[PDB]
Amino acid sequence: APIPTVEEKWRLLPAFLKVKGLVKQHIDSFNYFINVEIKKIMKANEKVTSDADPMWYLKYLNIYVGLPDVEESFNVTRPVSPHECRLRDMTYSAPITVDIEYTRGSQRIIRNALPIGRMPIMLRSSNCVLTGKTPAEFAKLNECPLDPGGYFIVKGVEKVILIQEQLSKNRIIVEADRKGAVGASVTSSTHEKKSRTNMAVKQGRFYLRHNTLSEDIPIVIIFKAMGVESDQEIVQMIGTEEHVMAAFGPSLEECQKAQIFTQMQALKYIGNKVRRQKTKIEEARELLASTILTHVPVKEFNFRAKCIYTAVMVRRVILAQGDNKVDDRDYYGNKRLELAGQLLSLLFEDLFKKFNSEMKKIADQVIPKQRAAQFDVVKHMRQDQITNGMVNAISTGNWSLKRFKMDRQGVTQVLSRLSYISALGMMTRISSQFEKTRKVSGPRSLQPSQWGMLCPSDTPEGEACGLVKNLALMTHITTDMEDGPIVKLASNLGVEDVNLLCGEELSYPNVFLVFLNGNILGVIRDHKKLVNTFRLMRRAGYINEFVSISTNLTDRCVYISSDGGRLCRPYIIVKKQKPAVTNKHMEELAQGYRNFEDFLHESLVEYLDVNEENDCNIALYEHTINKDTTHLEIEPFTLLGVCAGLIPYPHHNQSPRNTYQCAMGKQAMGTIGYNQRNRIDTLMYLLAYPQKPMVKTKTIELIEFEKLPAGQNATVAVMSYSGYDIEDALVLNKASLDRGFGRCLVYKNAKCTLKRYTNQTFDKVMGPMLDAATRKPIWRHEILDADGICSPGEKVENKQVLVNKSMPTVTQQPQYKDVPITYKGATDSYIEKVMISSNAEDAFLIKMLLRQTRRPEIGDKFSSRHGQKGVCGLIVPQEDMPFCDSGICPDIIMNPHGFPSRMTVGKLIELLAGKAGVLDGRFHYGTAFGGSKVKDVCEDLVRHGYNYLGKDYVTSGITGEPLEAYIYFGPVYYQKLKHMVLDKMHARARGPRAVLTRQPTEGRSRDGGLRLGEMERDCLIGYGASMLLLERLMISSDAFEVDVCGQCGLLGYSGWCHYCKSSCHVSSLRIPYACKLLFQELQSMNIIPRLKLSKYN
Amino acid sequence: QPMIYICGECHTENEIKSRDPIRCRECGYRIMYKKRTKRLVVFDAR
Amino acid sequence: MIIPVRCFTCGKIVGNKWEAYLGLLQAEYTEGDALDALGLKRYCCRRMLLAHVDLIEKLLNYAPL
Amino acid sequence: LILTRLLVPPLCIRPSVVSDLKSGTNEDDLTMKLTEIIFLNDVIKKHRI
Amino acid sequence: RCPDCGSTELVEDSHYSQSQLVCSDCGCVVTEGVLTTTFSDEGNLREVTYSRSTG
Amino acid sequence: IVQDEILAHRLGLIPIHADPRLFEYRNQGDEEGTEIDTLQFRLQVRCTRN
RNA sequence: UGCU
Ligand SMILES: *[C@@]1(O)[C@@H](COP(=O)(O)OP(=O)(O)OP(=O)(O)O)O[C@@H](n2cnc3c(=O)[nH]c(N)nc32)[C@@H]1O
Ligand SMILES: [Mg+2]
Ligand SMILES: [Zn+2]
Ligand SMILES: [Zn+2]
Ligand SMILES: [Zn+2]
């Protein structure tokens, strides 16, 4: 009697994606920031006034962002498209407007609409022009319908604000110190200040440490200062256990050693220990009330809640001092994800505060001593301050908020347009707070808390392994709630007030503490009933579905989380060994009677947090459901991310193989969108004949990657041929490459600017310099048109000019010097289009789109969607390629020796499924933890007449005799990578050198030479080739001849020593230029190296 | 010499001289492409 | 972008059958029997016609015109 | 050990790039430090006078 | 002018990433090699305007 | 919209029904071509609205 | 930022 299984259960994922998913997170965050958070910030800073000249004020009424507009026209707004912004290298922002009221000369004057700044509008947002548009309108606006969006366009470049991952605030963390002292820490962060206070047991007693105290003081003194002076009450609050009293005894003894017994004495001691920023007593009380533990509120200098909080902290420390139950930082249940909305809100608040301060300063400087003419803010309301601030913060990526003392870098990154998959995977990346500080390996390791939230296999391979992560296919990020009804329900559910009872009740085994966002909500008994009622109410809908509730029995604490940034995942509710969702509900969803919101409202599917699933039980499948089950997994394949979703049958391969496959798919070559022809980027790679994979995954169908594939399916035969596929290499077919297989197109952009300087002069394009001998343009200016601009359709060779630009040297007749834009390239390029635009600064921007059609050759890198990266080793002709009975020759021959060590059975399964699909005219599915089985494809093969194992009778093409072993033929989806041997080839002649040190440059684009690093020098030393090392590091790199005086040992010039004013003891000497520079720097540093020369004999 | 260009949305042949505000008639779009050359270009089928 | 004229593995003329395959798709013929009726015995041309994506019209929708 | 004269190095150690695209040039930090030192010496002399 | 033949047909032709002013008649190399900056060198040169450097 | 190189490659992949026995191989160079060893095919298509 |  097997449990019935709902087959259409996977239909819950598309319905969820219809309203949430991959890119909806940033869109919703930006919409909330521009709709509610900006209004809240404006209301917080609504009124600003100056101390001098009272009765003067500036009141803000309502702020608007408007629709995206461009300031190109002469004081005229005009709708501008994101594609136009990309073409013109401008910003896609909307004018921020506000209505204000002020008093000029005590007469109230109001303004209904006044611009104050420009906010870069995110694409596909609420106010974006792309939203609510059909694909026809997208085509009219020159934008791809499948484009994920969610990124900003500033100065033509596409920047994406990555999701930052930090530790949860207002939470006690018990951990070992540097030397190994088990202590506690708490970082109380409110809307104004953020203070971290620690507590250590370095000498058996609890010392509290804060940044505002000269020296750490005992906790008992702080207890006595915070109102509670009875040692009995302090001990009862700490705990009533024998070991607790034994551990706390030293603290009581140390406190009794001193004469501190009253609140006044304790406050005096604290004030004496307070650092400079009874007066000392007042400062100590103020620090204890506001500075220390800011998250714990005090009604009116009532430190009861703070006393209970520190008592619970000390109790946790005492409990941890025994059994090593140390909390881990890598537990994602205590992590918070800050989307772009919160960052933009903080930045806007800081910029608005700075603008208000500047306006107040200007008023204080202008109003009292200017003139009887009454001053008003409108004459000094800076409209470019906010615009420039936002543009710089989005472009440079460095955020420096002084009001919060936050100095972050790398917040924004250039959106990688290598492929649609690359852009979609980069849009859903997560950066960590560590940012490669230490090779801890803790946060870099894969924690079990990442189940269903982040992709386990998707991680960049390199130094950033483990710090850069991607979200799962099905997940959500919560926002902030009001916390009103939550507190009301908690109070109504019988939660006793903490102030009503003493701390002795905290030591009982049945009394469980309840916390709310780090604040002690109170105490409770029989927490099972409380949790059950809270969950039932949340399912009913009276409480927000995103409010998480968790219970830890080791500490007896029930946490109620309602802050934003928490990761949640939908789960089907299971009650009494039967899920709530049934076949009838799935059929209704398929027909359209209900949706995911209806499922959420009907208590069928609910969102679970990491802390909530820590206590709740989840089932993978229906057959796994037992008596002790509360939820059911929707789909197992959703564990993988977007980049990992392309892997066909990933559960049959190795984890490093999947990681490498995701890393290479982030660079896979293919189409970007339907507007790739009109799109003009600095570097683009396209495929001539892209084909969708035969073995496509449900994730592929969801992300619509089949519409924009990034590879081709080729008849690959796994065998060894000619020994040119020794180590991961492959052999390509000459005829296949000739017939268009693997053909790629490289598009490069060359931009030129003709700007007007301060003087009334402008850069001009000169016509082609015709040769008077032949009455035709010279070889360099051959491709130029009549206007001096290269025309499309022609070919460009090396050292040829594209724009014959000439600029003045004055900034009487202007003197123009030529600075043409020469083309640096080994191979020829063809001009496809030449776009000419005019900016508001009368500057002419000219962009020429160069194209290069390259054929796969030796050295090109290829991937097979399984991390089996390879390089083209040899290109054998078709007659040399083997043939089967049907006459089919393999296009790619891969090394079978790479299968045993890598355990890539998934590649074989994908090949078999693809062969079956191309035989039966179907598309097999390689869904993770499922998909088409091997038996089905074997049956398809045996029905179509081919072998049930893929191996077929093949005859050798060279000798014409059959092979002793059968060859494994089949269609495999191979994708070409951007790594080209034509671009990676380098050869450096003498070339140029650096001004500071006369050595070759670094990069290849600047014609740089190779570096014989310290390891190379060590190898040469070990070999003992002294002459070779000398010729490498002195003769061929920085050879130079200096003049050294044999009397003083200093460096001369032209055989003359200025120090001694003589030239008899001066002699030439070979020396590296770097060594000469070192000697000069030492002489500047007053460390004079005196060289005593002598004969070589 | 009459220099000809093409609008980004109208796709109409517009003639403008040097040092002129880049614009197209019966519209206000400011994207102007250059027509393909009339010279003979040889391509290889390889 | 557009259907290739020649097949990668063998080299049979297949670009001339793209419109015929589209017409068969518009008719009641399935993928399998359409590819069988088109005369493609070996699976290479079947894969070439089946795994091909039609993006030329999508690009022409953005073409200047 | 107590210095009364500072040895300004040659221009080979202090490379200067003439950025004609704007009204400025790229100078190393040593030049700015020496300029600040000279300014401070002049200010000290002015205060003494 | 060329130091060997005295001709004034001096052309700047870069031969495989090597700037070189060479005579077009006899091929006599007049000058070769140019001293550029490097990226780390470029980054460590600070931008100072004429408004401060000039005085 | 199709690239010039892709168009040339597609045209090269198009077979010709001409009898090869009646022609000869073109010598090294000679891009102008001779009547014996060359064939010219013109393709002029102008698309317009109906 | 990517590559081994
Ligand atoms: C990347 O996100 C950040 C991180 O760069 P850092 O390593 O923090 O830069 P650094 O600390 O200053 O390194 P170093 O001292 O060696 O110079 O910065 C961007 N980024 C850094 N380095 C590169 C690079 O070499 N190439 C590219 N394309 N981007 C780089 C990244 O956004
Ligand atoms: Mg390697
Ligand atoms: Zn001397
Ligand atoms: Zn127009
Ligand atoms: Zn074929």
Ligand SMILES: [Zn+2]
């Ligand atoms: Zn000469």
